[PDB]
Amino acid sequence: EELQVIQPDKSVETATLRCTATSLIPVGPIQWFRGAGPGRELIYNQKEGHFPRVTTVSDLTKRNNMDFSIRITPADAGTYYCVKFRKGSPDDVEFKSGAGTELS
Amino acid sequence: DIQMTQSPSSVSASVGDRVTITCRASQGISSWLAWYQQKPGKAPKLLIYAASNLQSGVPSRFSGSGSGTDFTLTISSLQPEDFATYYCQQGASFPITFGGGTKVEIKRTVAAPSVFIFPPSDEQLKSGTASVVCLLNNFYPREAKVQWKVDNALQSGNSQESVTEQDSKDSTYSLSSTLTLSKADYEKHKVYACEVTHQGLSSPVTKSFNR
Amino acid sequence: VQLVQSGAEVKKPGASVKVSCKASGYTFRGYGISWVRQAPGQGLEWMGWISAYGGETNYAQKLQGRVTMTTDTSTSTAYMELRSLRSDDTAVYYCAREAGSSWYDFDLWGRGTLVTVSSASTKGPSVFPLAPTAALGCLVKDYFPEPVTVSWNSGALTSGVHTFPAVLQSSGLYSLSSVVTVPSQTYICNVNHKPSNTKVDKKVEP
Secondary structure, eight states: OOOOBOOOOSBOOOOEEOOBBSOOOSOOOEEEEESOSTTOEEEEESSSOOOSSOOBSSOTTSTTOOBOOEEOOGGGOEEEEEEEEEOOSSSOEEEEEOSOEEEO | OOOEEEEOSEEEEOTTOOEEEEEEESSOBTBOEEEEEEOTTSOOEEEEETTTEEOTTOOTTEEEEEETTEEEEEESSOOGGGOSEEEEEEOSSSSOEEOOOEEEEEOOOOBOOEEEEEOOOHHHHHHTEEEEEEEEEEEBSSOOEEEEEETTEEOOSSEEEEEOOOOTTTOOEEEEEEEEEEHHHHTTOOEEEEEEEOTTOSSOEEEEEEO | OEEEEOOOEEEOTTOOEEEEEEEESSOGGGSEEEEEEEOTTOOOEEEEEEETTTOOEEEOGGGTTTEEEEEETTTTEEEEEEOSOOGGGOEEEEEEEEOOSSSOOEEEEOOOEEEEEOSOOOBOOEEEEEOOOEEEEEEEEEEBSSOOEEEETTTTOOTTEEEOOOEEOTTSOEEEEEEEEEOOOOOOEEEEEGGGTEEEEEOOOO
16 A cells, blocks of 8 residues: 655646645655755755745645645756655655656 | 743633633744643643644634744633643654643632641551641632641641642642651640631631640 | 553662553554653653654653663554663653654554652551541551552542542652541541552541
């Protein structure tokens, strides 16, 4: 029954970067990166921060919520990854990422 | 470490009142604040999470608000089951911290304690210790100063005191206080008295015994 | 869906304790576990958290170095060890499922385990009378450890009875009193101290 991050669109004014989790467990926040290397760039964090550009379709403060879809210039282009983190200490841990979405 | 400060420490209320309790975080914790209820002998129980989300099954009587540093739990139309201690808890980061707690107790009319003293007994005295017990029965509010006097001299450091939880039927409290002395020193003094001060007595009632 | 904790412990200062907590009725590994303790008459104190998925831990500063939390995924059990025990570790210790998505909260709780840390050694109570709307009672004195139980006339007499919370004396031993407001029968406080196999029945005579 392993959790999956369903990034439905291979490719996508306010763009919408769609994410859906199949499970709540293991518990932990949903984060977005542009790209994936040691240089990847954070775009949203459910756990902490202020992201005036980014906005969420569903109330991520509800325990049972599985919709992690966000409503976010040519500088914006790139591959986006919805990453599910599992709780850790000192830091959370990449659990599963969706396959990626190319913003054009 | 994020310090959580809960105000007030005690609230008194009658069935049907609205009660509001507050929690202040020493810094911003977004809306990651939970509230628990604990009754005597029981594990805490989660009522509200993320500042305002009810847990499934929790009555709509309860609700919560706030973001950043200031937060509120409200209990509308209090019922006998809602009389308890409530704790807030920050959930933004380790280490997890709880507030100090707010006790919600039943308002009723002022009632004065019925006072009784109890000397030690020969059996106890045969051991080599003496306990003199004062009982303040069935009073309200909780606040009561008990002072022990031995041959008209005020005692300090040599008594301990215990309170019952508010009573099921009458919403009142009782209090026991025990003065503990050597056999040697119990028998060198003569008059043993407990003076009780309380919001429902005109003058401080005293009860005594001479040996 | 529950957490079932091990039984009450009685330890000596400098000793060690290990409390267990068995989960059932949910996917254990999906969630965290935290331990929270409460000393007598006090509030709640968070001790630490452990990921049931990867075993990452975080402990309160105060307890770093003396505490260890582990899990056994094979049995869905959480364990808390606490070392170099002092008197002020005396408290009820709770296990709680930590179940927030991107916050921490505790939605399922164990019933608690009492840990008593003291120099003292098991001892039954001496029971003395508080000789007689009138009032009378029973002074249960110098026992260890918690708890004791007090009935009046074998459960028969219930009304206007007030059995007081025990107080811990400078001796390291506990004392409480049970009072009873009678109208101005025979009376017999029934004291039971399970931990010393000790049970006393004493009659408060005028």
